[PDB]
Structure 1
């Protein structure tokens, strides 16, 4: 690794890493907020949209982070550009790619 990188093109993947959602956050809360941008992936065995909520190790409460798998990478990227710096539930979220 170094200062200059060979893959100069930007890898827009279909899963995003969101921060600062709140201690009160659900899979379907993140899904129903991000749905306005595009279609989010969904596991049918659980019946929930593919979103992994980060829970804290010592406190056992929600950290306010989640990984949101969209069906399309342009939808994943658009959700970042749109929701980065916006309030999820009174909390200003910081949205990035899950990489």
Structure 2
């Protein structure tokens, strides 16, 4: 969250999306606040859904990255505590937990 200046943080973490959600739907729900950054290697928007390895069901968790950091900040200020696909969600500032194994 506010634990960093986020001057280099353009990603938000999301929880509660749903067990049947899609990258395109999440992107359509976040793009209305600001431009989601697009992958130039894959052409899909920067969203990463997560899955349970013990059940194979979706965690309801995902990251979304923005083309600018103030858009990510507005996305937290706005989407945090709203609903998506008919499910309550929770947005906040992300980091790179990937860096523990990358």
TM-score normalized by the length of structure 1: 0.85
Q: Deviations over 1:40-81 (max 9, x none)?
A: 011133221011101111111111111101000000010011
Q: Is the 8 A contact 2:51 2:57 kept in 1?
A: yes
Structure 1: tracts of 5 or more residues without a match:
1-6
Q: Is the 8 A contact 1:18 1:96 kept in 2?
A: yes
Distance 2:4 2:82 in 1: 29
Equivalent residue of 1:71, what SS?
A: coil
Q: Is the 8 A contact 2:6 2:69 kept in 1?
A: no
Q: Is the 8 A contact 1:17 1:67 kept in 2?
A: yes
- After superposing on structure 2, the runs of 4+ consecutive aligned residues of structure 1 that deviate more than 3 Å are 7-12
Task: Judge which range, 61-70 or 7-16, deviates more.
Answer: 7-16
**Number of residue pairs matched by the alignment:** 93
Which structure has the larger Rg over C-alpha atoms? 1
Distance 2:5 2:68 in 1: 18
* Alignment-derived partner of residue 17 in structure 1: 13
Task: Judge which range, 62-71 or 36-45, deviates more.
Answer: 36-45
Q: Deviations over 1:13-44 (max 9, x none)?
A: 20000000000111111100001111101113
